[PDB]
Design an enzyme around this catalytic site. Structure first.
Site, PDB file in Angstrom:
ATOM      1  CG  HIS B  15      -1.882   1.161   1.197  1.00 48.32           C
ATOM      2  ND1 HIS B  15      -1.452   2.472   1.560  1.00 48.32           N
ATOM      3  CD2 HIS B  15      -3.177   1.272   0.836  1.00 48.32           C
ATOM      4  CE1 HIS B  15      -2.503   3.305   1.454  1.00 48.32           C
ATOM      5  NE2 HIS B  15      -3.579   2.583   1.016  1.00 48.32           N
ATOM      6  CG  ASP B  17      -0.851   6.363   2.706  1.00 51.55           C
ATOM      7  OD1 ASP B  17      -0.282   7.398   2.160  1.00 51.55           O
ATOM      8  OD2 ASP B  17      -2.078   6.244   2.901  1.00 51.55           O
ATOM      9  CE  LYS B  18       1.337   0.334   8.097  1.00 48.77           C
ATOM     10  NZ  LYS B  18       2.500   1.087   8.608  1.00 48.77           N
ATOM     11  CD  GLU B  43       7.871  12.983   8.409  1.00 48.40           C
ATOM     12  OE1 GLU B  43       7.282  11.896   8.131  1.00 48.40           O
ATOM     13  OE2 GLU B  43       7.561  13.676   9.410  1.00 48.40           O
ATOM     14  CD  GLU B  56      13.556  17.971   9.578  1.00 51.77           C
ATOM     15  OE1 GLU B  56      13.017  17.295  10.551  1.00 51.77           O
ATOM     16  OE2 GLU B  56      12.902  18.425   8.597  1.00 51.77           O
ATOM     17  CE  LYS B 164      -7.003   0.864   1.911  1.00 54.17           C
ATOM     18  NZ  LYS B 164      -7.734   2.098   1.540  1.00 54.17           N
ATOM     19  CG  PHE B 233      -6.577  -3.979  -6.634  1.00 54.58           C
ATOM     20  CD1 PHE B 233      -5.591  -3.076  -7.011  1.00 54.58           C
ATOM     21  CD2 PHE B 233      -6.891  -4.131  -5.287  1.00 54.58           C
ATOM     22  CE1 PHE B 233      -4.910  -2.347  -6.049  1.00 54.58           C
ATOM     23  CE2 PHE B 233      -6.243  -3.363  -4.330  1.00 54.58           C
ATOM     24  CZ  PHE B 233      -5.224  -2.519  -4.719  1.00 54.58           C
ATOM     25  CG  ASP B 241      -3.332   5.623  -4.275  1.00 49.59           C
ATOM     26  OD1 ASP B 241      -3.515   6.716  -3.751  1.00 49.59           O
ATOM     27  OD2 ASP B 241      -3.688   4.579  -3.770  1.00 49.59           O
ATOM     28  CB  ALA B 242      -0.020  10.537  -3.512  1.00 48.68           C
ATOM     29  NE  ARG B 247      -2.864  10.655   5.171  1.00 56.90           N
ATOM     30  CZ  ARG B 247      -3.067  11.404   4.105  1.00 56.90           C
ATOM     31  NH1 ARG B 247      -2.172  12.309   3.759  1.00 56.90           N
ATOM     32  NH2 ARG B 247      -4.164  11.249   3.392  1.00 56.90           N
ATOM     33  CE  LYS B 248      -3.518   3.660   4.834  1.00 57.18           C
ATOM     34  NZ  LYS B 248      -3.774   5.096   4.864  1.00 57.18           N
ATOM     35  CE  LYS B 268       7.019  11.382  14.492  1.00 54.44           C
ATOM     36  NZ  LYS B 268       5.729  11.493  15.215  1.00 54.44           N
ATOM     37  CG  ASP B 274       4.831  11.641  18.732  1.00 54.10           C
ATOM     38  OD1 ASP B 274       4.193  11.960  19.731  1.00 54.10           O
ATOM     39  OD2 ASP B 274       5.014  12.409  17.775  1.00 54.10           O
TER      40      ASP B 274
HETATM   41  C1  LIG Z   1      -9.584   3.585  -3.723  1.00 53.11           C
HETATM   42  S1  LIG Z   1      -7.948   3.603  -4.411  1.00 53.11           S
HETATM   43  C2  LIG Z   1      -7.024   3.924  -2.943  1.00 53.11           C
HETATM   44  C3  LIG Z   1      -6.638   2.619  -2.226  1.00 53.11           C
HETATM   45  O1  LIG Z   1      -7.627   1.579  -2.391  1.00 53.11           O
HETATM   46  C4  LIG Z   1      -6.968   0.393  -2.830  1.00 53.11           C
HETATM   47  N1  LIG Z   1      -7.302   0.158  -4.264  1.00 53.11           N
HETATM   48  C5  LIG Z   1      -6.733   0.707  -5.395  1.00 53.11           C
HETATM   49  N2  LIG Z   1      -7.319   0.199  -6.525  1.00 53.11           N
HETATM   50  C6  LIG Z   1      -8.247  -0.692  -6.108  1.00 53.11           C
HETATM   51  C7  LIG Z   1      -9.218  -1.602  -6.756  1.00 53.11           C
HETATM   52  N3  LIG Z   1      -9.279  -1.623  -8.093  1.00 53.11           N
HETATM   53  N4  LIG Z   1     -10.014  -2.386  -5.975  1.00 53.11           N
HETATM   54  C8  LIG Z   1      -9.927  -2.327  -4.622  1.00 53.11           C
HETATM   55  N5  LIG Z   1      -9.070  -1.505  -3.943  1.00 53.11           N
HETATM   56  C9  LIG Z   1      -8.228  -0.713  -4.629  1.00 53.11           C
HETATM   57  C10 LIG Z   1      -5.437   0.564  -2.768  1.00 53.11           C
HETATM   58  O2  LIG Z   1      -4.724  -0.111  -1.697  1.00 53.11           O
HETATM   59  C11 LIG Z   1      -5.299   2.068  -2.722  1.00 53.11           C
HETATM   60  O3  LIG Z   1      -4.187   2.421  -1.898  1.00 53.11           O
HETATM   61 CL   LIG Z   2      -6.716  -1.856 -12.161  1.00 45.88          CL
HETATM   62 MG   LIG Z   3      -3.641   7.406   1.742  1.00 48.79          MG
HETATM   63 MG   LIG Z   4       4.995  16.193  12.193  1.00 44.30          MG
END
Ligand SMILES: CSC[C@H]1O[C@@H](n2cnc3c(N)ncnc32)[C@H](O)[C@@H]1O
Ligand SMILES: [Cl-]
Ligand SMILES: [Mg+2]
Ligand SMILES: [Mg+2]
Ligand SMILES: CSC[C@H]1O[C@@H](n2cnc3c(N)ncnc32)[C@H](O)[C@@H]1O
Ligand SMILES: [Cl-]
Ligand SMILES: [Cl-]
Ligand SMILES: [Cl-]
Ligand SMILES: [Cl-]
Ligand SMILES: [Cl-]
Ligand SMILES: [Cl-]
Ligand SMILES: [Cl-]
Ligand SMILES: [Cl-]
Ligand SMILES: [Cl-]
Ligand SMILES: [Cl-]
Ligand SMILES: [Cl-]
Ligand SMILES: [Cl-]
Ligand SMILES: [Cl-]
Lengths: 385, 385
Positions: B15, B17-18, B43, B56, B164, B233, B241-242, B247-248, B268, B274
């Site tokens: 993922h 962010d991970k 970061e 830093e 996910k 997927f 997808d940034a 963020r998790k 960190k 933290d």
């Molecule tokens: C909604 S897209 C943002 C996040 O949802 C998940 N995602 C991206 N594309 C798909 C897909 N086609 N089906 C299900 N989840 C997705 C990914 O892990 C992503 O980081």
């Molecule tokens: Cl796709």
């Molecule tokens: Mg995110």
């Molecule tokens: Mg900070």
């Protein structure tokens, strides 16, 4: 009386993570103002002399990303290297994947739109303040807002944009209900200029910031004050200290109270369940308390990507409900529409041109009276017994 | 029996962010291995064909940031554009402010080091699993770990790194104690290649992933399965997808249970309250339950920048404590040392060369048995009555 201590914090608008939240939401407001149907996932980062906007936007709008970044930094007070970022001279990297909407020939509705993502969101409310928020959070937040206000109105012109606040509240537990007793500790760490002495900083923070914000009934001779405890804070914002969107999610919500499902808010268009989901469960929890069904309430909703109906809902009143939590659950599910397409319409979240989301990206998404905060408007609920 | 539904989620190592969490922690482990006294605030962000490391670092270490970024992406499986990032060909922007330590002539100890920042952290434990974690979180997390394991060992070679998971658990409340009854809904959304049909995906997810992870006692004929509910997927990770570090934070901790104080972990150095603060209050809460003083426990600590002693501590047993919460508070404060310099020493967090923090940056910081997870080792506590 047995009590306990609960702490919440806040960061000022010039904190570099919060700067990124505000830039991300200013970009979103600028897209929505021209194109209410914009899809926006706009991430900001910052470090010494640099901002970068990135992520993904589909829109018909014409938005000057660089200008939004510079105008947002300038309105915060980042007008020179000395203050921690020069809005006018800093590097701005425009790194967004920008698309116009799909062009198609021939071939649905809000009720059937699937969630854009999976996830879960919590809503909380408590009768301990008029805004039905936790006191620790409300006082930390309002001390940060006050710092910004006395800087900008020139009452404390020695202030600079960055800083942090923190409030420890001594509470009593009345059978599940939180009864604030007193403020135990107040912490302020504020950026400042080179004119002002440590003693003028301490004096102005007590008289111009603490005394106007914190009700005298909660302050006494034993309350602990930490005012700039780590010495001088002249350098601030991005200088020597990296910011990212979505790194203050507990300050954006309930300060450690209730719960969080993990989704950041800023830079996301309000069709995204992380935002519309969280907002509606704030309105639900707030409406449970305000209608008199409970003194406190926690509500969770959860979603599957491509599924319109929530996977799960729950209510917890911390045993303050005047009717069973199973019945409050039933009244919540009956009164609120958790389907993603319907939440955006019901809270009117796409309506443009009032700087609505930029307002939410500093000093909290919940507990404000601003009429653009539609999730703060209580729904009348039918119950009895 | 009256029950309720509680949902937790997880994201896979691919993922985006991970991916940023793991790159940030691989950088930290590489600094600590040579220089245990490194100061690290690293970061990471990512988008299509790009990673940027920033923030830093003060260290004596010699670290190849670009190589750490590429090796981390490659070991995850990001080996081509098709899979969502080419470790070997993607742009890597090295944007860290790197310093060697101060050089000084003439002129303190762990007991008196002030906290590096303000903030508050929560620890949680519950007797509902052997790892004293919430079931919803433990099953979501272990379904993600399992996906990574059957991809890499070639049992499901059609898998790709991203994905996910999400688990809804039906619970009973026994007087404050959480009694898991059954799994209500299981959601998996996994990245995959173009070979495999929707039916092979569903079949392999049930037999190779769900059935080995989720105890048969919790699964029945009414359990709902959502397997790739939004269709195919194929594209994943940073592509379109940034990602950003931090963020998790709810997947890193308790999945919506207990509470969060807001501080991210990854990138960190472990002197930062933290991280060391959160770890010690996990060990405290876990030690309260494991010693038999309670079935569940929540602990908060809070800090001021430049102050060694915590501003506040609290314990909540959700009325499961066998002795009063005020007394458990007393035993926690007596047994644990919340001073920042002492927490790092007591949990041995600076010791280098075992990939300790890279291990924590996917599939959760808590509930793992790995001996590098020193905060998971229960402290014996004295109590009685
Ligand atoms: C909604 S897209 C943002 C996040 O949802 C998940 N995602 C991206 N594309 C798909 C897909 N086609 N089906 C299900 N989840 C997705 C990914 O892990 C992503 O980081
Ligand atoms: Cl796709
Ligand atoms: Mg995110
Ligand atoms: Mg900070
Ligand atoms: C510990 S430095 C990281 C954060 O702490 C706060 N900070 C930075 N410098 C100082 C200082 N000199 N005193 C107190 N807080 C600071 C800033 O808001 C920053 O974002
Ligand atoms: Cl520029
Ligand atoms: Cl489109
Ligand atoms: Cl969404
Ligand atoms: Cl000055
Ligand atoms: Cl300074
Ligand atoms: Cl509604
Ligand atoms: Cl307001
Ligand atoms: Cl490169
Ligand atoms: Cl140094
Ligand atoms: Cl710190
Ligand atoms: Cl393929
Ligand atoms: Cl200890
Ligand atoms: Cl493990």
């Amino acid at each position: 009386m047995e009590t306990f201590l609960f702490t919440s914090e806040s960061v000022n608008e010039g904190h570099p993570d919060k700067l990124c939240d505000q830039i991300s939401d200013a970009v979103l407001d600028a897209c929505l103002e021209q194109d209410p149907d914009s899809k926006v996932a706009c991430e900001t980062c910052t470090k010494t002399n640099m901002v970068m906007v990135f992520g993904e936007i589909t829109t018909k709008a014409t938005v000057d990303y660089e200008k939004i970044v510079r105008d947002t930094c300038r309105a915060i007070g980042f007008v020179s290297d000395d203050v921690g970022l020069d809005a006018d001279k800093c590097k701005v990297l425009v790194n967004i994947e920008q698309q116009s909407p799909d062009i198609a020939q021939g071939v649905k509705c809000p009720e059937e739109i699937g969630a854009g993502d999976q996830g879960h969101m919590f809503g909380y409310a408590t009768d301990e303040t008029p805004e039905l928020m936790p006191l620790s959070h409300v006082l930390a937040t309002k001390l940060g807002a006050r710092l910004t206000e006395v800087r900008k109105n020139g009452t404390c012109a020695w202030l600079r944009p960055d800083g942090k606040t923190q409030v420890t509240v001594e509470y009593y537990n009345d059978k599940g209900a939180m009864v604030p007793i007193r403020v135990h500790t107040v912490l302020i760490s504020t950026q400042h200029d080179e004119t002002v002495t440590n003693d003028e900083i301490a004096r102005d923070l007590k008289e111009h910031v603490i005394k106007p914000v914190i009700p005298e009934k909660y302050l006494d001779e034993k309350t602990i004050f930490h005012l700039n405890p780590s010495g001088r804070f002249v350098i601030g914002g991005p200088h020597g200290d990296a910011g990212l969107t979505g790194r203050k999610i507990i300050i954006d919500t309930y300060g450690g109270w209730g719960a969080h499902g993990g989704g950041a808010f800023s830079g996301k268009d309000p069709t995204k369940v992380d935002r519309s989901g969280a907002y509606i469960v704030r309105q639900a929890a707030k409406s449970v308390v305000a209608n008199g069904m409970a003194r406190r309430a926690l509500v969770q909703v959860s979603y599957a990507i491509g599924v319109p109906e929530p996977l799960s809902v729950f209510v917890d009143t911390y045993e303050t409900g005047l009717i069973p939590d199973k019945e409050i659950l039933k009244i919540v599910k009956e009164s609120f529409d958790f389907r993603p397409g319907m939440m955006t319409i019901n809270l009117d979240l796409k309506r443009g041109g009032n700087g609505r989301f930029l307002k939410t990206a500093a000093y909290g998404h919940f507990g404000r009276d601003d009429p653009d905060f539609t999730w703060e408007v209580v729904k009348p609920l039918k119950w009895d017994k």
